[PDB]
Amino acid sequence: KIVNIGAVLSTRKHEQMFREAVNQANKRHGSWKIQLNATSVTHKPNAIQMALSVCEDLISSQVYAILVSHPPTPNDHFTPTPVSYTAGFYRIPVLGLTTRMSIYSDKSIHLSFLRTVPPYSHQSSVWFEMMRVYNWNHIILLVSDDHEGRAAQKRLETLLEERESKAEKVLQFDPGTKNVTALLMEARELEARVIILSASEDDAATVYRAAAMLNMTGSGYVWLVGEREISGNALRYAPDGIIGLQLINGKNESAHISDAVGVVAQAVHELLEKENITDPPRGCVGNTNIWKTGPLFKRVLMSSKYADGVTGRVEFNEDGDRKFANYSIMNLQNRKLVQVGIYNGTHVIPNDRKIIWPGGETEKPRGYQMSTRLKIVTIHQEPFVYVKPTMSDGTCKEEFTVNGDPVKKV
Amino acid sequence: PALNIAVLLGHSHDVTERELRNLWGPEQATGLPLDVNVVALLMNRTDPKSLITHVCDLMSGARIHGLVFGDDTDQEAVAQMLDFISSQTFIPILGIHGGASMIMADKDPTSTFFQFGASIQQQATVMLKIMQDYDWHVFSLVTTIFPGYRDFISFIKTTVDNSFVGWDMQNVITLDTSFEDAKTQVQLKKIHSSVILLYCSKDEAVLILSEARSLGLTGYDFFWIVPSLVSGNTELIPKEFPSGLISVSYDDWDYSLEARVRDGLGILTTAASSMLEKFSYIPEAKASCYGQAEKPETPLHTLHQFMVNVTWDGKDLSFTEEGYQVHPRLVVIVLNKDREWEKVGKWENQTLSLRHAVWPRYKSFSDCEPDDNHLSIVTLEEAPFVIVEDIDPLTETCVRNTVPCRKFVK
Amino acid sequence: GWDMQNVITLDTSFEDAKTQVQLKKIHSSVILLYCSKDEAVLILSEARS
Amino acid sequence: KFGTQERVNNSNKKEWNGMMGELLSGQADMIVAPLTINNERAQYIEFS
Amino acid sequence: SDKFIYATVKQSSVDIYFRRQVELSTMYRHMEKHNYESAAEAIQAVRD
Incomplete structure (x- = not known):
C-alpha cells in the first residue's frame, strides 16, 4: 500500500522540503488508500560512492521512482x-530536476530517465522560430564536437529540412580549444552574418574573444546563443547585442521538486489503478x-499531464523531456542582460523593450551581405580559354585581332 | 613488468577459472617486453553493487590493468554500467558476451570501454551488401520510435546517396504508437511489394508482423531483411516471423566464449606491448573505487589511443574511435522452413561470403501460395544471341540491360 | 484494353478476416462496386480504413 | 579535369574533381568555361 | 580492336556520357584504358 519514493538531493534543507512536497501531494488525491513515503540521500563526491549509496539506501527501500538533482558545487559533469544507471538496471524511472544535458535525451542509453527541465539542445527550436520571425535565411553554426x-546541430538541421534550406557552414570545434581563430577566419569569408553558437561557458568565452579580435562583433552581425553562452565567464566577454536564452525555472530546484513530486504521485496513483x-x-x-511494470510505469509517467x-x-515527449518550457530572450545591452521577449512552449513573443543589435544599431540587420568579388575557375581549352605565360613585369602583351581591336586579357 | 588482466564471467557458462588461467598459456613469447598473469573470478548474477565491489576488489587485490568482463544474460543495462566503471576507474573494460556485448550508441569520452559487437552502421552495411549480392534494390524501410531509429535512417540515407546503385527508397513508415489501431494501418497500406528493412524491438516487431500478415505483407515476393535488434534471442522464435526472414547478428555458434576471452586477453596484451614500445612503463592501477582522491584523475599515458592499432596472430582486432570493432564477427542468418535460425553467410575483412549463390525461395507460411512464377532457365552462351560477361568493376553487380546468371565452373 | 485486374467476392464477414486480405490485392484503379446500399456502406468504411 | 563523380579510396565516398570539386567546396563561385550540361553535374550545381 | 585505338579526355562530360549509356559500354571499356589527361594532349596524339 505504501509507495516509497527516493530523492537524490543536494542539501538537507532541500530534502526536508522534498518531504514536505511529498506530504502535500499525499494530502491531495490520495486514491483513498495509498499513503506515499519519502526517502532522501545527499549527493556524494564520488560516483562509485553514490552508486553504492543508491543501491543501499534507495534501492533497498523499494523506491518506485528516484528524484535526482545537481549538487550545490558548481561542477556539473x-x-x-x-x-539513472543504477535505477535504470531495473527500469526504475529516474526524475531529473536540474539536468539540462542532451545526452540523457537518447533513450537507447538512458532507459528510464525523465527530466522536468528540457535540455540545451531544444534551444535550437527557438532559433528556428527567430529565423521565422526576422527572416534570416543564411546562418552559420558554431558547435562543439561533443554530444551536445x-x-x-542535428535538431536544427532536421528543423531546417522542413523548409528546404540548410546552414551555409557548420563549424565543429573540439571542447576546450584555446585557439579557435582559424574557424572564425573561415567563417568570415562566408556571406551569412547570422552566427549561432552552441558551446560551454569556457568555449563560448573563447569564441567571443576570438570574434572580438576579428572585429566580428560590430554592425551587420547578429548572434544567437543559448543559456550556457550568456551565463558565468561567457557573460564577461559576451559581445553587446547578443541574443541569449534563459530558463524561467532552470535553477529553481524548489519548483522542480514540487512539480516532479506531484507528477510522480499522480503517475503512481494511475499505475495502481491498473x-x-x-x-x-x-x-x-x-x-x-x-x-x-517498469516500462509501463515509465509510459504512464510519459502520458501524465500536470x-x-x-x-x-x-x-x-517521446524523448523524455518536458517539451514545454518558457525561454526568456535576454539581449546584452550596455553589458547588462535585459529581456526583449519570451519564448513560451511553442511561440516567441516580444515586448516593449527595443533590441539593440551588435554595433549599437537599432534597425534589424540583414541576414547576409552579398559578395561582389567572385572566385572564377577556368580550364585551358584552346578555342575558348587561351592561357599564356606573362612577361617579367607581370602583364602580357597587348594583342590585336584582324580588325585591330585589343584582345581583353585577365 | 607484469600485466594483471582480470576476466569475469557468469555461472551459466561452464568454463572454470582454471581453464581461463590456462587459456593464456600458449608459450610462444606472446608478450616480448611483459608477461601476463591472468586472474579470473565469477559472480552469481550481474547487478550494480556486486559488480562494482567485484571489479574494484579485483583492482585492490590483483592490481589489474584491464578487464575482459563477459555477461551471460540479455540485460542491456550492464553495458552502460561497465562503461562507467571504466569511466570512474580508468581500467580498460571489454564487453565480451551477453548484455555487455550489445553496442551502446554514445560512450563517455573519458571512458576506456570497448565492446565485442557490431554497431547499427555495420549491420546496415552488411544488409546492403546482402541486397547488392541478391540485387534486391527496391526496398521500403519501416522504422519506429524505438531508440536509434534516427541514426539508422541517417546512415541508410547517407549510404544510398553515396551509393552507385539505384536504391529506390520508396517510403519510411514510423509507427509512432498504436500499432494495432488507426492511422497506422493507412500508413502500412502505402507499402509496395519490396524488401522491408524493419527496425524495432522483438515483441513490437511481432505486433507489426502480425499486422503485416493481416494485410498480406508476407509471401514469396515479400522479402524482409532485419538487424540483430529484432532477431534477439535465437533460441526463442515468434510464430509471426516468416520463413526466409534474413537477419544479421554477432555469431554465437562458431565464436566460442573461449575464443572471446582469448581475443580479449590478446588485445589487451598487444596494446600494452605497443605502449611499452612507445611509452616508458605500465601505469599503476588506481588505488580503489573510493577515497575521493584530490587529483584531476588524468593518467599520463593510457591504452585508449593504442587500441586503434591492435593486431593478433591471424586476425585484426582493432577498434574505432567510437568503440566498435573495425572487423566484427557478423553472420547473416535466415529462418528456414524448420523455424530455426540457420546461419547462411559470414562477414570477414569487409567482405560478405554467402553460402547460397542464388537465394533459395522460402515458404513464408503454411498457407502461402506455391512457387510457380519462379522458373529455372537453362541458357548456354552462343556468340551473337546470349553473351556471358563478368561482374561490373564499378558497380560490383550486373550492368544495365543485363541480368544475373550463374555458371557452375569446376 | 480493359485490364480487368481482379474480382473480389466478399462472400461474408465484411468486417472480419480473409476479406481484408482480399481487399489488399486491389491496385489503384476504378472500382466497379456491386452490392446493396448498406453493405456498400460497410465496404466503403473498410476501404477508407 | 572538367569534373566527374569519383569514389575516393577512403570510406568509398563520392567526390567531385576538377571544376566541380573546386566549385562545390567553396573554392570557386562561378565556372565560365566549356562545361557541358548533364544530369550528374546538374544534380549538384545549377547551369545557366 | 587493338589496331584501331580511339580515346577521349579522362574525367569529362563525354566520359560520363559513355559510362552511363546503356549499350556503348563495350567500347567504353576499351576507351577506359586509353583516356588522356587533357584535350590538347589527345589532339597532339591524333596529330602524330
Whole structure:
C-alpha cells in the first residue's frame, strides 16, 4: 500500500522540503488508500560512492521512482548519471530536476530517465522560430564536437529540412580549444552574418574573444546563443547585442521538486489503478531481473499531464523531456542582460523593450551581405580559354585581332 | 613488468577459472617486453553493487590493468554500467558476451570501454551488401520510435546517396504508437511489394508482423531483411516471423566464449606491448573505487589511443574511435522452413561470403501460395544471341540491360 | 484494353478476416462496386480504413 | 579535369574533381568555361 | 580492336556520357584504358 519514493538531493534543507512536497501531494488525491513515503540521500563526491549509496539506501527501500538533482558545487559533469544507471538496471524511472544535458535525451542509453527541465539542445527550436520571425535565411553554426553540439546541430538541421534550406557552414570545434581563430577566419569569408553558437561557458568565452579580435562583433552581425553562452565567464566577454536564452525555472530546484513530486504521485496513483503491478525489488545485491511494470510505469509517467504546475503545464515527449518550457530572450545591452521577449512552449513573443543589435544599431540587420568579388575557375581549352605565360613585369602583351581591336586579357 | 588482466564471467557458462588461467598459456613469447598473469573470478548474477565491489576488489587485490568482463544474460543495462566503471576507474573494460556485448550508441569520452559487437552502421552495411549480392534494390524501410531509429535512417540515407546503385527508397513508415489501431494501418497500406528493412524491438516487431500478415505483407515476393535488434534471442522464435526472414547478428555458434576471452586477453596484451614500445612503463592501477582522491584523475599515458592499432596472430582486432570493432564477427542468418535460425553467410575483412549463390525461395507460411512464377532457365552462351560477361568493376553487380546468371565452373 | 485486374467476392464477414486480405490485392484503379446500399456502406468504411 | 563523380579510396565516398570539386567546396563561385550540361553535374550545381 | 585505338579526355562530360549509356559500354571499356589527361594532349596524339 505504501509507495516509497527516493530523492537524490543536494542539501538537507532541500530534502526536508522534498518531504514536505511529498506530504502535500499525499494530502491531495490520495486514491483513498495509498499513503506515499519519502526517502532522501545527499549527493556524494564520488560516483562509485553514490552508486553504492543508491543501491543501499534507495534501492533497498523499494523506491518506485528516484528524484535526482545537481549538487550545490558548481561542477556539473553528469552528476545524475550513476543514479539513472543504477535505477535504470531495473527500469526504475529516474526524475531529473536540474539536468539540462542532451545526452540523457537518447533513450537507447538512458532507459528510464525523465527530466522536468528540457535540455540545451531544444534551444535550437527557438532559433528556428527567430529565423521565422526576422527572416534570416543564411546562418552559420558554431558547435562543439561533443554530444551536445552534435545533437543541437542535428535538431536544427532536421528543423531546417522542413523548409528546404540548410546552414551555409557548420563549424565543429573540439571542447576546450584555446585557439579557435582559424574557424572564425573561415567563417568570415562566408556571406551569412547570422552566427549561432552552441558551446560551454569556457568555449563560448573563447569564441567571443576570438570574434572580438576579428572585429566580428560590430554592425551587420547578429548572434544567437543559448543559456550556457550568456551565463558565468561567457557573460564577461559576451559581445553587446547578443541574443541569449534563459530558463524561467532552470535553477529553481524548489519548483522542480514540487512539480516532479506531484507528477510522480499522480503517475503512481494511475499505475495502481491498473492491474498486475509488481512490487519493487529489495537491494541491488540478490535481485537481477528487471521490474516487470517498469516500462509501463515509465509510459504512464510519459502520458501524465500536470494541470496546475508551479513551473507551468508539465508534459512529456517521446524523448523524455518536458517539451514545454518558457525561454526568456535576454539581449546584452550596455553589458547588462535585459529581456526583449519570451519564448513560451511553442511561440516567441516580444515586448516593449527595443533590441539593440551588435554595433549599437537599432534597425534589424540583414541576414547576409552579398559578395561582389567572385572566385572564377577556368580550364585551358584552346578555342575558348587561351592561357599564356606573362612577361617579367607581370602583364602580357597587348594583342590585336584582324580588325585591330585589343584582345581583353585577365 | 607484469600485466594483471582480470576476466569475469557468469555461472551459466561452464568454463572454470582454471581453464581461463590456462587459456593464456600458449608459450610462444606472446608478450616480448611483459608477461601476463591472468586472474579470473565469477559472480552469481550481474547487478550494480556486486559488480562494482567485484571489479574494484579485483583492482585492490590483483592490481589489474584491464578487464575482459563477459555477461551471460540479455540485460542491456550492464553495458552502460561497465562503461562507467571504466569511466570512474580508468581500467580498460571489454564487453565480451551477453548484455555487455550489445553496442551502446554514445560512450563517455573519458571512458576506456570497448565492446565485442557490431554497431547499427555495420549491420546496415552488411544488409546492403546482402541486397547488392541478391540485387534486391527496391526496398521500403519501416522504422519506429524505438531508440536509434534516427541514426539508422541517417546512415541508410547517407549510404544510398553515396551509393552507385539505384536504391529506390520508396517510403519510411514510423509507427509512432498504436500499432494495432488507426492511422497506422493507412500508413502500412502505402507499402509496395519490396524488401522491408524493419527496425524495432522483438515483441513490437511481432505486433507489426502480425499486422503485416493481416494485410498480406508476407509471401514469396515479400522479402524482409532485419538487424540483430529484432532477431534477439535465437533460441526463442515468434510464430509471426516468416520463413526466409534474413537477419544479421554477432555469431554465437562458431565464436566460442573461449575464443572471446582469448581475443580479449590478446588485445589487451598487444596494446600494452605497443605502449611499452612507445611509452616508458605500465601505469599503476588506481588505488580503489573510493577515497575521493584530490587529483584531476588524468593518467599520463593510457591504452585508449593504442587500441586503434591492435593486431593478433591471424586476425585484426582493432577498434574505432567510437568503440566498435573495425572487423566484427557478423553472420547473416535466415529462418528456414524448420523455424530455426540457420546461419547462411559470414562477414570477414569487409567482405560478405554467402553460402547460397542464388537465394533459395522460402515458404513464408503454411498457407502461402506455391512457387510457380519462379522458373529455372537453362541458357548456354552462343556468340551473337546470349553473351556471358563478368561482374561490373564499378558497380560490383550486373550492368544495365543485363541480368544475373550463374555458371557452375569446376 | 480493359485490364480487368481482379474480382473480389466478399462472400461474408465484411468486417472480419480473409476479406481484408482480399481487399489488399486491389491496385489503384476504378472500382466497379456491386452490392446493396448498406453493405456498400460497410465496404466503403473498410476501404477508407 | 572538367569534373566527374569519383569514389575516393577512403570510406568509398563520392567526390567531385576538377571544376566541380573546386566549385562545390567553396573554392570557386562561378565556372565560365566549356562545361557541358548533364544530369550528374546538374544534380549538384545549377547551369545557366 | 587493338589496331584501331580511339580515346577521349579522362574525367569529362563525354566520359560520363559513355559510362552511363546503356549499350556503348563495350567500347567504353576499351576507351577506359586509353583516356588522356587533357584535350590538347589527345589532339597532339591524333596529330602524330
